Amino acid sequence: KLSSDYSLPDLINTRKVPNNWQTGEQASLEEGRIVLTSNQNSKGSLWLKQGFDLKDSFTMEWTFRSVGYSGQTDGGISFWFVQDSNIPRDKQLYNGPVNYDGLQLLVDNNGPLGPTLRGQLNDGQKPVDKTKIYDQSFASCLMGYQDSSVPSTIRVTYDLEDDNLLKVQVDNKVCFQTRKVRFPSGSYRIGVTAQNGAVNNNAESFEIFKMQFFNGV
Description:
By secondary structure, this protein is an all-beta fold. The protein has no helices and 15 strands.
């Protein structure tokens, strides 16, 4: 049930960035992956050009890794499913929109529990208090992500016909789920952003190996 216009092919043997996606800031396609960060204090975006018209259920699988640094930082990678009439112009929150309307999934390790993958909601009306990110997650889970030889796959499933289940999974292992989130039908934006910040002069490099978008669950 895979959808091509909203997915990212095998980047191995892709030499030019696929035409249905746009990169930004220091994001380039190196070697079978889109490297979002790689120089000290870098940032990178990678978003779909066309907007997804959400009416029914969906499954969204991201595949990523981090390399080149072990230790605490204010860096992080975040995945977005946010309502907007184009690629979000705001970059103030992990190289992404601080004033979003939908879902942010943040992988970082600067919070009270160390490495996590967390859930974050806003409605577009007022931007989020970044100093409150960790107090304001609707759901989270412990998640070693730093360096781990193999990439992790985050699987986001939204099951409209089951009292709207938002279930996130890391490597087929349940990270969290809820029914407190019901996306109103609209045109949504899909992308990932990152930054490694400045702490301890780190060069944490975030890589995107693939992303798959299915209609339905």
